[PDB]
Amino acid sequence: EATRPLSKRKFFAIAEIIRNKGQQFALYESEAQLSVAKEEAQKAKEFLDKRSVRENK
């Protein structure tokens, strides 16, 4: 929206965000990292357990 000159090239200011897609794209990124870490750990534990079972045979 129109505003007083705030710099040489800046004459507009944000007023509101209809769509927060950019905001969500970072929250989801961090959440994905955190969840992937724990899911990795669980599945790696399962694989190690299966290796132990086949070692016992």
């Binding site: 929206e1 944000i14 007023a15 509101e16 965000i17 209809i18």
Partner: protein
Amino acid sequence: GKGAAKYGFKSGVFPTTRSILKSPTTKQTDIINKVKSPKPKGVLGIGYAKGV
């Protein structure tokens, strides 16, 4: 000559007529109501949002 077709085929220009009352009067209820009406909220509107 061509552009005059837009303006009723009148060649030449008069100076723009001045308004006696520069600003709306207080007896124009409709203009005041539109001015006083709640501004449309969001982007199809005209104003800053509550949080921004």
